Amino acid sequence: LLGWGLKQAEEANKTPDKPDKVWRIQAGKGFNEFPNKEYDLYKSLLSSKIDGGWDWGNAATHYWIKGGQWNKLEVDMKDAVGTYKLSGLRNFTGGDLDVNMQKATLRLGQFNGNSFTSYKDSADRTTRVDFNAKNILIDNFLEINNRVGSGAGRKASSTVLTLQASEGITSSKNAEISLYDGATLNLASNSVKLNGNVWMGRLQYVGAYLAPSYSTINTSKVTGEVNFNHLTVGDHNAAQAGIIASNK
Amino acid sequence: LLGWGLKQAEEANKTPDKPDKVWRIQAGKGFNEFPNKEYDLYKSLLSSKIDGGWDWGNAATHYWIKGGQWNKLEVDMKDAVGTYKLSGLRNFTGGDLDVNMQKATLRLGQFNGNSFTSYKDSADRTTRVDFNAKNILIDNFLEINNRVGSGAGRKASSTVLTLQASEGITSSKNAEISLYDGATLNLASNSVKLNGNVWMGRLQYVGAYLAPSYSTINTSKVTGEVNFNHLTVGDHNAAQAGIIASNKTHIGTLDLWQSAGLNIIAPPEGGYKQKTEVQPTQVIDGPFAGGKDTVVNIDRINTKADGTIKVGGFKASLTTNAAHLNIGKGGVNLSNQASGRTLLVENLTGNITVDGPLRVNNQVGGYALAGSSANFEFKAGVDTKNGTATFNNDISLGRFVNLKVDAHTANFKGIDTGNGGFNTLDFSGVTNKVNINKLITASTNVAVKNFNINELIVKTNGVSVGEYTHFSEDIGSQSRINTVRLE
Q: Which Gene Ontology terms cover its molecular function (chain B)?
């Protein structure tokens, strides 16, 4: 009932969290010497400090960082040349990644899509999931602030999916970006061209036909040519989405 | 499920522990004046501050340091000349020994072997058991990270057995080194020669047929001649062991499992080298390239294969990113169950030179039934793509055995697949040439991109029609066959 103009203006100015256990992973040698290798990046680097899980209540998978979602991590490559896929991170609760991948083409999809959620606990935390790749090339679906299963388990709090590549964030025809009730996302490359389903706002729960369900795609400093193809605001609710674009 | 390449790269960079009660023992006088005495070293020095025990649950013996395993000790001799045996330390839980024995020959065996375990408590501690002897001369068995008895009592956490002598770590014929699910061990002398059973990975529990069971023998700075004799990776599990050697690794008998792995990794070229709480920089490497003179002379490969029957193969591997992979005269063996067993002889950034005959079920031709399609596999110079798979020996395929090579210029000398037929003689990843000198095919699935097979044999297959030598890809421009012979 608040309105998006209040909500984004008060959520774009926060402190991130209080993360204890700042795990600091760094890619060493071997990664930075094959320009065409097509690494995986979940199992080949991340999956030591990202654990699976089962929730008592609507579980299929459950991912956080390490011993509770109130922990950070980081990944400081800055030289690991290749092409890195994610391929299958579903119901990721986590917190405060920043996969700092200089000189690395990204991909977020092969044989499975992705998800980036948090939990509505007593902290009501964000996720602040950054990336710093070279392209991005999303190339499969992505479910920012989705539901765990259906109804059971817990509630989901907000999130941020910043994505700050440096060549152009293209996408695919079958890449349905489905950001929900709380999710925003920045972008800061030049010449985004999302050639797939941008789905701002959805029924996060199946019965909640009366959610406000805000969002934002704050493509804030995109210095080239913003270009959507298929924007689908709202689904069975008054989804008051917003976009703060960059004057084209 | 993590993989060894993550596990060792995150376990080689830790803090040891938080030990209270740093007992500091020091050998005084009397020890340093008999060069030939043959001391015992458990009872004569250690056994004041190492106590026995009984566990309620699967106990025979139980050793720790003093009042709980969270205590260190040390032994600072640095002059105690003699020859010191251990002889009988079984189920040692302990923690953080470093028996600093300068100018002292060691021994770890007489009338009884040894063990070095920890416990999987709420701390999940290592053991970090160092030594600093002059030779080592293991000379009996050793059970690093073993089980207490069987099942009962408690679980076991990780361990480290560093062994940093200064003359050469030999061993005995009856010295079975049995490192298990968690155990690693460094070595840093020159010219190791383990002339006994190296057993990486074992059933730590009797029912746990599904453990990952990693290990490592990081013979990291061994400045002389690494030399195994009998390496036996895996036992009824997918034991993904690894070795980070020092660019000359002669080994002898390799006895893998169906589904156990191996990662013999060469050095790099230059050689090696409330409140928010900040973990240290957990540096982790990726799969890198060997140096130039990185030699891996695995001169006999065997592969046992027994158990139940799965829908497919199991594909034991040995990722070997040295800039060579010579395989000598025993060549390649395999053993085949009802499903086709599979061997994965990779090389990331080197060559392959197999001068030995391929066998399966230990015969040169190696016939196999239609369901048991044995799958040999070679990947020479994968991530450089100028890697050759030279087979300087006459290979021989029986029936339902499968070769595939993904190399740059896979040279050969002689191929025998027409004796049995039904042999998937794949060449799907060959960059340019397959310079086979002699070819025998009857009912074969040869597919070469470019070649010059300067002699051809075209055999029949009795009465079966439709089954023949079926070239199934591009033969291309520079191709050549200097002699075709239809029998």
A: toxin activity
Breaks (C-N over 2.5 A) in chain A follow: none
Residues in contact with B231: Cβ distance below 8 Å, sequence separation at least 6, in sequence order: B198, B200, B251, B252, B253, B254, B255
B288 vs A25: CB contact, 8 Å cut-off?
no
Residues of chain B contacting A21 with CB distance shorter than 8 Å? 277, 279
Number of A to B CB contacts under 8 A, please give it.
Answer: 67
- Domain count of the fold of chain B: 1
Residue B256's CB is within 10 A of a number of other CB atoms, namely 26
Interstrand relation of A216-218 and A184-186 (parallel, antiparallel or unpaired): parallel
What experimental approach yielded this model? cryo-EM
Q: 3-state DSSP call for residue A234?
A: coil
The DSSP element (H or E) to which B5 belongs, if any, is helix B4-11
For residue B65, the enclosing domain spans: 1-487
Cα–Cα distance measured from residue B21 to residue B96, given in angstroms and rounded to the nearest whole number: 11
Question: Long-range pairs for B34-38 at CB < 8 Å and ≥24 separation?
Answer: B34/B81, B34/B82, B35/B81, B35/B82, B36/B82, B36/B83, B37/B82, B37/B83, B38/B82, B38/B83, B38/B85
The partner residue sitting opposite A31, judged by closest CB among B279, B281, B286, is B286
- Between chains, do B286 and A43 touch, taking CB under 8 Å as contact? no
* SS3 state of residue B243: strand
The angle at the Cα of A100, spanning A94 to A102, to the nearest 5 degrees, equals: 155
Contact between A127 and A94 under an 8 Å Cβ cutoff? The reply is yes
